Amino acid sequence: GSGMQIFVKTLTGKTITLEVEPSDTIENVKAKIQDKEGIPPDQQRLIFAGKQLEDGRTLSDYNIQKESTLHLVLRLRGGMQIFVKTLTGKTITLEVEPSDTIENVKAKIQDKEGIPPDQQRLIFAGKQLEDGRTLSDYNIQKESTLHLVLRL
Amino acid sequence: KQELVTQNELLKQQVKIFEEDFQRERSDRERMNEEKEELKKQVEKLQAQVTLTNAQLKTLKE
Amino acid sequence: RKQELVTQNELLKQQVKIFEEDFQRERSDRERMNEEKEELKKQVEKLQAQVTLTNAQLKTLK
């Protein structure tokens, strides 16, 4: 086996380890981070030895050996944001990506606004958004507007 | 170090200020959207209205 | 706490950069939304001139 353990620490001191390979690209390692600590790759830059790492590069390319600590900086935003208007009149702003389920949307409306997802209904283009489908599925891309209605 | 302590809280100070200036433009887009939705409604009534008055121009010409 | 203060420095310089990048991306988004709203205003005129053009064509039927 060519496997090897690795540590990647946040700027706050919350440190995390992953089992990776020299083969792995940097975008792959970012994908691995998202898997444990849900942190989209468009919201993370990785630094090693005072160098930003290119997404499509290996650990071998930047000569990272077994159990080398790496530094993780968080971004303020990612690629894609969508808006949600309520009935009482307010728009909130969500940090999203196309492959988020509708479940994952309501989850971070609960984080922003405190309304349980159990009671949230989302509408786009007059259609009631089913939980297990993505933003891609309804053709929801950047800057689009959803409408929030509570029921049950 | 003393230089570093002064150096580092200056950088933390920039981080915070830039985070706030991020929200500046962020909530600015939120108002821009509601301004755009208010106008998307306003386009559509005219979009139908032009046909309304076009359908009563050809018929009215006969 | 000095290699600490240095290692924390280097990363803290890296953060200020990032948050600048993201602030200026947010700025360019709002400015893009602003010109998007500015051209929906254009449409409202397009569709208002058309109606009163049509309305002045049919009104002259006295």
Side-chain angles (χ1 to χ4, degrees), chain C residues 26-41:
Chain C
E26 201 76 357
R27 193 152 85 98
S28 60
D29 287 346
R30 185 222 55 198
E31 295 176 319
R32 201 218 299 105
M33 286 190 68
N34 180 245
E35 66 198 55
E36 281 171 354
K37 96 175 290 288
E38 271 274 21
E39 280 190 275
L40 288 169
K41 288 165 171 275

Side-chain angles (χ1 to χ4, degrees), chain B residues 11-54:
Chain B
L11 303 154
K12 295 181 175 74
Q13 194 181 357
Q14 305 293 290
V15 171
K16 288 186 166 72
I17 291 164
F18 275 142
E19 211 272 321
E20 179 192 311
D21 296 14
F22 161 79
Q23 298 299 157
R24 189 176 324 290
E25 306 288 36
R26 176 56 77 99
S27 66
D28 221 320
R29 292 214 284 160
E30 298 188 301
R31 187 206 77 178
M32 282 277 172
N33 185 44
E34 292 160 322
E35 280 183 300
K36 271 171 70 188
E37 301 299 298
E38 165 193 275
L39 262 63
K40 281 177 177 287
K41 302 172 205 266
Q42 214 167 72
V43 161
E44 269 302 295
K45 82 170 190 79
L46 281 157
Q47 204 93 66
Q49 184 180 337
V50 81
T51 304
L52 175 276
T53 191
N54 274 154

Side-chain angles (χ1 to χ4, degrees), chain A residues 9-102:
Chain A
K9 193 168 79 175
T10 53
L11 300 176
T12 306
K14 302 181 71 69
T15 178
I16 296 98
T17 190
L18 305 157
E19 190 78 349
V20 74
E21 275 182 44
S23 323
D24 275 58
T25 53
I26 301 304
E27 59 197 354
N28 199 308
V29 185
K30 285 176 184 152
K32 292 193 71 70
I33 290 165
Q34 188 190 36
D35 300 354
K36 286 180 68 172
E37 293 280 71
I39 302 204
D42 64 6
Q43 293 191 231
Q44 42 177 296
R45 178 96 295 156
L46 295 173
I47 306 300
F48 179 74
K51 269 94 177 186
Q52 298 206 126
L53 310 175
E54 289 176 33
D55 274 321
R57 292 275 267 182
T58 74
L59 304 174
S60 302
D61 294 347
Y62 292 93
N63 293 320
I64 293 101
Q65 285 196 318
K66 291 184 181 176
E67 279 174 285
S68 289
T69 189
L70 186 150
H71 304 292
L72 175 56
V73 181
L74 282 171
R75 234 190 280 271
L76 281 179
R77 56 184 296 264
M80 180 191 163
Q81 295 73 10
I82 59 172
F83 311 113
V84 188
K85 203 179 289 162
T86 63
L87 292 175
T88 187
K90 186 65 198 284
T91 50
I92 62 170
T93 177
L94 287 183
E95 208 59 53
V96 292
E97 51 187 20
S99 69
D100 293 343
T101 54
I102 302 304

